[PDB]
Swiss-Prot record, chain A:
This is Large ribosomal subunit protein uL4A. N-terminally acetylated by acetyltransferase NatA. Component of the ribosome, a large ribonucleoprotein complex responsible for the synthesis of proteins in the cell. The small ribosomal subunit (SSU) binds messenger RNAs (mRNAs) and translates the encoded message by selecting cognate aminoacyl-transfer RNA (tRNA) molecules. The large subunit (LSU) contains the ribosomal catalytic site termed the peptidyl transferase center (PTC), which catalyzes the formation of peptide bonds, thereby polymerizing the amino acids delivered by tRNAs into a polypeptide chain. Component of the large ribosomal subunit (LSU). Mature yeast ribosomes consist of a small (40S) and a large (60S) subunit. The 40S small subunit contains 1 molecule of ribosomal RNA (18S rRNA) and 33 different proteins (encoded by 57 genes). The large 60S subunit contains 3 rRNA molecules (25S, 5.8S and 5S rRNA) and 46 different proteins (encoded by 81 genes). uL4 is associated with the polypeptide exit tunnel. uL4 interacts with its chaperone ACL4 and the nuclear import receptor KAP104. The chain holds residues 312 to 362 of 362 of the full protein. It comes from Saccharomyces cerevisiae (strain ATCC 204508 / S288c).
UniProtKB/Swiss-Prot annotation, chain C:
PANTHER family: 60S RIBOSOMAL PROTEIN L27A, LARGE RIBOSOMAL SUBUNIT PROTEIN UL15. There is a cross-link at K95 (Glycyl lysine isopeptide (Lys-Gly) (interchain with G-Cter in ubiquitin)). Residues 1-13, 20-29 have a biased composition (Basic residues). The keyword Aminoacyl-tRNA synthetase does not apply. Changing Q37E: Confers resistance to cycloheximide, an inhibitor of polypeptide elongation. HAMAP family: Ribosomal_uL15 (MF_01341). Belongs to the universal ribosomal protein uL15 family. The keyword Ubl conjugation applies. This is Large ribosomal subunit protein uL15. One of its GO terms (molecular function) is RNA binding. It is found in: Cytoplasm.
From Swiss-Prot, chain E:
Belongs to the eukaryotic ribosomal protein eL21 family. GO terms for cellular component: cytosol; cytosolic large ribosomal subunit. This is Large ribosomal subunit protein eL21A. There are 2 genes for eL21 in yeast. SUPFAM superfamilies: Translation proteins SH3-like domain. Component of the large ribosomal subunit (LSU). Mature yeast ribosomes consist of a small (40S) and a large (60S) subunit. The 40S small subunit contains 1 molecule of ribosomal RNA (18S rRNA) and 33 different proteins (encoded by 57 genes). The large 60S subunit contains 3 rRNA molecules (25S, 5.8S and 5S rRNA) and 46 different proteins (encoded by 81 genes). Keywords: Cytoplasm, Isopeptide bond, Ribonucleoprotein, Ribosomal protein, Ubl conjugation. It comes from the Eukaryota. The gene is RPL21A. InterPro entries: Ribosomal_eL21, Ribosomal_eL21_CS, Ribosomal_eL21_sf, Translation_prot_SH3-like_sf. It comes from Saccharomyces cerevisiae (strain ATCC 204508 / S288c) (Baker's yeast).
Swiss-Prot record, chain F:
The modification N6,N6,N6-trimethyllysine is found at K49. SUPFAM superfamilies: Ribosomal proteins L15p and L18e. GO terms for molecular function: RNA binding; structural constituent of ribosome. Belongs to the eukaryotic ribosomal protein eL18 family. The gene is RPL18A. There are 2 genes for eL18 in yeast. It is found in: Cytoplasm. It comes from Saccharomyces cerevisiae (strain ATCC 204508 / S288c). GO terms for biological process: cytoplasmic translation. GO terms for cellular component: cytosol; cytosolic large ribosomal subunit. Pfam families: Ribosomal_L18. Transmembrane segments: none annotated. This is Large ribosomal subunit protein eL18A. Its main location: cytoplasm.
Length: 51, 58, 148, 222, 157, 185, 49
RNA sequence: AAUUGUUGAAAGGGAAGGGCAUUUGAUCA
RNA sequence: AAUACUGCCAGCUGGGACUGAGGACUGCGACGUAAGUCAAGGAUGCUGGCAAUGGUUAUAUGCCGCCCGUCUUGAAACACGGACCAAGGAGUCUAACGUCUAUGCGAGUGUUUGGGUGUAAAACCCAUACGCGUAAUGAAAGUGAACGUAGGUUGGGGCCUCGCAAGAGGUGCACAAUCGACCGAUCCUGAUGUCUUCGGAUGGAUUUGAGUAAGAGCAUAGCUGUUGGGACCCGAAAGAU
RNA sequence: AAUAUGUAAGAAGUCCUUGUUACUUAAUUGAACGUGGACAUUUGAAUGAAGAGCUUUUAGUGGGCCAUUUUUGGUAAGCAG
RNA sequence: CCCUGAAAAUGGAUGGCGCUCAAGCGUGUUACCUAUACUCUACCGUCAGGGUUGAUAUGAUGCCCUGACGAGUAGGCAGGC
């Protein structure tokens, strides 16, 4: 009879997607990626400032 | 008193408001207009093959 | 009629359902069949062809009395005899006795060929007969008769 | 007439099985999304660090929103705009990208705006304004039961599979879009941000190609 | 007055192509002509017997009739708001074979062969044709191709 | 404004129950729509649709047509049913035993069928005997055999029986039908 | 005057027939008058038929 | 009813008349 | 390292405005081990005041609003008619009809020309003729529709069988076109016979019909439209006796 | 050139074998119609489809104008075309 | 940019008042107001897809569910006073 909007109603969003509980528990919306450091080649740096 | 002579405005809209479709294709086309001898032998061939089919399969 | 007509429903409308650009004046195209070759020739040509001209003879004093010649195809040939005897004569097929059919008493003067009577004798008495009809009656075993 | 208890238990078991299947499918899908984004980021970083340049493939998605009304429209562009289920001012539809569809949008382009969206915007739009077309009826998508009963032939049973097929075009995209009714949605919350709507993005207007800028707009547009 | 004839406003239509004047080369006459074959029409001004009208120029139709030296072509005409067929006869000159039917034939032959050799195993036959899909990812290496700066040229009189 | 691609609030183009106020026909229609709604066989639906046809859309079926239909193999043990009228044909003398159901039966046709050994039943008897329509066969009369079907389609080079009240000489046989007096059609 | 596909009719109503149209509104009256005349004659003719 | 006289009420800086909504006055279940 | 910018959170929370439709339960879910509970297919609980809210009209206030009907691409016009009120006032009827619809009968259909009867212009009953259809084609003389399961092929709803279903096989009315068969006219060839010029069997047509190929028509009523009538109403300058 | 425009993108299809003809070929050499048999996931490029096709009837209409672009007559025109 | 070029008849028009680091001119960036424009909700009507003789219980042309739409001269059809 009435349309209930998800992402504002907890029960309707949980019913629509069972992953709501696991997503909230694991906090998958804020994930820290692996700290990998790669240095660009000298050619890229030279061509970035090439005038 | 002058008057309009010819005008093509709204003719396209007028004709196009009713859906214009390709002519309904028929699996057996009309044979009118062909060479007469082709008909004169086609009728005999059809009669012969029909009688052969009737004799073979009943 | 007056209640079911749409003139009552047309009340209020200025033109009464007949157009405002062109008012319902008198006959604009003429009276009756005004014009058949000048402006109404299109309708006389593509809808009513054959109206203008002489086609044939000049037959004076046409009397519809010598021309009485109906059609009695053999399919509706057993409808003349009464119902009570139709079945009993259908079952009884013999040449010693034959059923007399007077189509003239029924009002038909000519027998026409169509219907495929079964193989039973039959006697008919007609003013006129057809070749294929004659063959069809004579095939079963009967024969038509000519009277005047 | 004691079968009511048995059928209720059977329905509960079937539901639970379906929800477990949906949960594991969603876990697999989100693993795919995170692996794909990490892989593309690492590929870009490796190309940068290796003294090379990474060429990004043309995006396999596009979102078209009508901005032009129904008045003063020529025949051909009017009909091709309506051909993509764009019959309403401020309406949206999903189109896959191919030369036919590229020229289709190019002819349409004068009168609409388009861009390549991300996953979050599709998720939010489908969750909020998800409407479907079952037997030409506008049935809102509030339960997965109807979509799993009607899309069982193609293997789609939850909206998450529909979202995955939308973002990742596959063998079951055409009828998935056919299910999705064109979305009718209100005017932007923060406005178009441009005084003259009927200007190209190069000319400084909302109309035209938006690339990834369509995400923020559709967030405010919806 | 007014001029709307059988060959009105055809100054450049029924005109022989440059360096193609004279008699017609003897290869179009020996082509075998059948019924039900897709084919087009192009008029030739060399012979003044049986030319197609201006509308029929450049039109394609199906052959239904064969005669000593003539063909019968079905041509759809646009008048009013209805598609209507029209039977017309031209000489064997102004009738050119169409390659679209040949393309369809070779495509269906190749498709049948591919379907046979695929159903021999049954693995991803992919019978349908695909349009121009977007290009995939690519890697560009600047080895010997270092980019150089581009600047607009100043206006030159 | 919305760019509509077709007509709005257009009727389906199909009739919904005869305009006739026949309470018997109304009750029979009600029974058959109940049958169509609460069953799955297409028989109820086609009977519902053919029940709506008018008097010119329900041409009469002669007993000769029924006999010809019964000549086909595997149809002898079939309940012949026709929507409309059943009329006796004087060109048929032999009639095999069968069971015919129709709206109304002609006195002559009914007498012929009962003499041949067959029985006459109405629509409700057929419904109560074969609710799903088992071993049945449905006919429709010749719709394009009327005196007016030949009249439509008038035009040149078509010859579709123009509208003349009387038939005879000088009656649409002059110029317009003969080449000797000008053009032909 | 001239119209679409309707049959050709010739209605011979063009003279002053307003004053000439006659309607037999007295059918029953004439029937009873003839019956009364027959009865009176029968009572008058004697047993002659 | 058109027109007019009286009684009672209301309004009136070169028109009156109506719609959107309300105050005030009178009246009303 | 931090910060700017962009995007994400199925992260939390504060404030304000509109809505309360549905009416015993049925469905999808959460919390809760488990009872039971819930923000889960549309609002309930408590409390306060009165027994004024609200409807109509007049004025006032802020905004908007040109005079009705017709002609016209264009009307409010410096285009036309209107001072007001009351009474009358304009697509009706007949004859023959077309499409559609309803009813009755049905290869037949139509009592009411007339007769009998009658509670009396009411109603009931009735024989023969007659109109239309069941046969059409030719100017006419005239002739006149099954080689067949009333033909072959296709699409065909429905029905029957097999098949868990889906699908497969058979029959397939009506309809759609095409190829065929027969009938009338025209062009032809010409079998026995013979009042030597009659007779027209058999076989064909790039010819032709408003034909047959298991009849469908008749009577009445109703909307609409056409013809004739004064013909939706009113209006001429004229002509005759 | 651009724009505009026609055709085709399949079961009314493709393939194998062979029955008829008074057409035709020196000739079972060709053509039309056929019988039997093989090819349903992806039935043969994308999108869409308050479904598509067909028949009858008739009201009103047959004085147009304006706007971007192309363009005729005219110097131009709220000019004409 | 501004000015001379640049003169028409009742008294008048960036609407006027007025405006000079403008309230004039070009461009750039946010905020603000609205249409019978878009979204949601309530009601009316039309259309379409459906359910409801297992009843006493009637109007199955009755009742109920879902969704879409609602402008308009001449004119057509339907429902009513």
């Amino acid at each position: 009879v009435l349309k209930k909007n998800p992402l504002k109603n907890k029960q309707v969003l949980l019913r629509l997607n069972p992953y709501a509980k696991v997503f909230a528990a694991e906090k998958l919306g804020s994930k820290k990626a692996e700290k990998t450091g790669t240095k660009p080649a000298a050619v890229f740096t030279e061509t970035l400032k090439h005038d | 008193a002058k008057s309009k002579n010819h005008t093509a405005h709204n003719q396209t809209r007028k004709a196009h408001r009713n859906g214009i479709k390709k002519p309904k294709t028929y699996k057996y086309p009309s044979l009118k207009g062909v060479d007469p001898k082709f008909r004169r032998n086609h009728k005999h061939a059809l009669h012969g093959t029909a009688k052969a089919l009737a004799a073979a399969k009943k | 009629p007056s209640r079911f007509t749409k003139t009552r429903k047309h009340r209020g409308h200025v033109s009464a359902g007949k157009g405002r650009i062109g008012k319902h004046r008198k006959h604009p195209g003429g009276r009756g069949m005004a014009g058949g070759q000048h402006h109404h020739r299109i309708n006389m040509d593509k809808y009513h062809p054959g109206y203008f001209g002489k086609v044939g003879m000049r037959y004076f004093h046409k009397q519809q009395a010598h021309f009485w010649k109906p059609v009695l195809n053999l399919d509706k040939l057993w409808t003349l005899i009464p119902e009570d005897k139709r079945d009993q004569y259908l079952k009884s097929a013999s040449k010693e006795t034959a059923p007399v059919i007077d189509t003239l008493a029924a009002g038909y003067g000519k027998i026409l060929g169509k219907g495929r009577i079964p193989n039973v004798p039959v006697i008919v008495k007609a003013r006129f007969v057809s070749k294929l009809a004659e063959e069809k009656i004579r095939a079963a075993g009967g024969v038509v008769e000519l009277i005047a | 007439a004691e079968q009511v208890a048995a059928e209720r238990a059977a329905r509960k078991a079937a539901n639970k099985e379906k929800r477990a299947i949906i949960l594991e499918r969603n876990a697999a899908y989100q693993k795919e999304y995170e692996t794909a984004e990490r892989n593309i980021i690492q590929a870009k970083r490796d190309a940068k660090a290796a003294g090379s340049y990474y060429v990004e493939a043309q995006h396999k998605l596009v979102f078209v929103v009508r901005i032009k009304g129904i008045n003063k429209i020529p025949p051909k562009p009017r009909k091709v705009l309506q051909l993509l289920r764009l019959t309403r001012i401020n309406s949206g539809t999903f189109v896959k990208v191919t030369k036919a569809t590229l020229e289709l949008l190019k002819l349409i382009e004068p009168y609409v705006a388009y861009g390549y969206p991300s996953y979050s915007t599709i998720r939010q739009l489908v969750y909020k304004r998800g409407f479907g077309k079952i037997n030409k009826q506008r049935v809102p998508l509030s339960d997965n039961a109807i979509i799993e009963a009607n899309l069982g032939k193609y293997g789609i049973l939850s909206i998450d599979d529909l979202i995955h097929e939308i973002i990742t075009v596959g063998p079951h995209f055409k009828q998935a879009n056919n299910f999705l009714w064109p979305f009718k949605l209100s005017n932007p919350s923060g406005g178009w941000g441009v005084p003259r709507k009927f200007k190209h993005f190069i000319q400084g207007g909302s109309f035209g190609n938006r690339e990834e800028f369509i995400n923020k707009l559709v967030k405010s547009m919806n | 007055g007014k001029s709307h004839g059988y060959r009105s406003r055809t100054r450049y239509m029924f005109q022989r192509d440059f360096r193609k004047h004279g008699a017609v080369h003897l290869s179009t006459y020996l082509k075998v002509y059948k019924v039900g074959d897709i084919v087009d029409i192009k008029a030739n001004g060399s012979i003044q017997k049986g030319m197609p009208h201006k509308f029929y120029q450049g039109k394609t139709g199906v052959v239904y009739n064969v005669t000593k030296s003539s063909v019968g072509v079905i041509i759809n005409k646009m008048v009013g708001n209805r598609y209507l067929e029209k039977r017309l006869n031209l000489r064997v000159e102004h009738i050119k074979h169409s390659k679209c039917r040949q393309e369809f034939l070779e495509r269906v032959k190749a498709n049948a062969a591919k379907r046979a050799e695929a159903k021999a195993q049954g693995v991803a036959v992919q019978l349908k044709r695909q349009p121009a899909q977007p290009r995939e990812s690519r890697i560009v290496s600047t080895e010997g191709n270092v980019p150089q700066t581009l600047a607009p040229v100043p206006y030159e009189t | 404004g919305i760019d509509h691609t077709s007509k709005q609030h257009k009727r389906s183009g199909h009739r919904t129950a005869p305009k006739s106020d026949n309470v018997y026909l109304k009750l029979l229609v009600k029974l058959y729509t109940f049958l169509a709604r609460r069953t799955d066989a297409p028989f109820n639906k086609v009977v519902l649709k053919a029940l709506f046809l008018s008097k010119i859309n329900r041409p009469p079926v002669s007993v000769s047509r029924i006999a010809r239909a019964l000549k086909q193999e595997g149809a002898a043990n079939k309940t012949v049913v026709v929507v409309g009228t059943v009329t006796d044909d004087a060109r048929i003398f032999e009639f095999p035993k069968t069971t015919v159901a129709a709206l109304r039966f002609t006195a002559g046709a009914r007498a012929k069928i009962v003499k041949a050994g067959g029985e006459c039943i109405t629509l409700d008897q057929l419904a109560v005997r074969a609710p799903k329509g088992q071993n049945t066969l449905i006919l429709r009369g010749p719709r394009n055999s009327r005196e007016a079907v030949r009249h439509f389609g008038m035009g040149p080079h078509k010859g579709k029986a123009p509208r003349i009240l009387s038939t005879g000489r000088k009656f649409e046989r002059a110029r317009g039908r003969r080449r000797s007096k000008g053009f032909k059609v | 005057a001239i119209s679409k596909n309707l049959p050709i009719l010739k209605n011979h109503f063009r003279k002053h027939w307003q004053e000439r149209v006659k309607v037999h509104f007295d059918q029953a009256g004439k029937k009873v008058s003839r019956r009364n005349a027959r009865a009176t004659r029968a009572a008058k003719i004697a047993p002659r038929p």
